Amino acid sequence: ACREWLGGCSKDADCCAHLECRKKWPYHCVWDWTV
């Protein structure tokens, strides 16, 4: 399973979808339009 928004990201390949791995703690998936 993938981590969604505000879920701890294991990959910057938008993890779930339309996301990315925030390069600042907490390292969790954020929307591309929220970073």
Curated annotation (Swiss-Prot):
Enumerate the subcellular locations listed in this protein's record, separating them with semicolons. Answer: Secreted
| Tissue-level expression | Expressed by the venom gland.
Superkingdom classification of source:
Eukaryota
Please name every pair of cysteines joined by a disulfide bond in this record: C2-C16, C9-C21, C15-C29
Give additional notes from the record: Negative results: does not inhibit TTX-resistant sodium currents on rat dorsal root ganglion (DRG) neurons. Has no activity on voltage-gated potassium channel Kv2.1/KCNB1 expressed in frog oocytes. Does not show activity towards Nav1.1/SCN1A, Nav1.2/SCN2A, Nav1.4/SCN4A, Nav1.5/SCN5A, Nav1.6/SCN8A, Nav1.8/SCN10A sodium channel.
Q: What is known of its domains?
A: The presence of a 'disulfide through disulfide knot' structurally defines this protein as a knottin.
Q: According to its UniProt entry, what is the function of this protein? A: Potent and selective inhibitor of hNav1.7/SCN9A (IC(50)=610 nM). Also shows a weak activity towards Nav1.3/SCN3A (IC(50)=7950 nM). In addition, inhibits voltage-gated potassium channels (Kv) in rat DRG neurons. It does not alter the voltage dependence of activation, but it causes a small hyperpolarizing shift in the steady-state inactivations of Nav1.7/SNC9A.
So what family is this one in?
Belongs to the neurotoxin 10 (Hwtx-1) family. 39 (Jztx-34) subfamily.
- What is the protein name for this chain? Mu-theraphotoxin-Cg1a
What is the species of this protein? Chilobrachys guangxiensis (Chinese earth tiger tarantula)
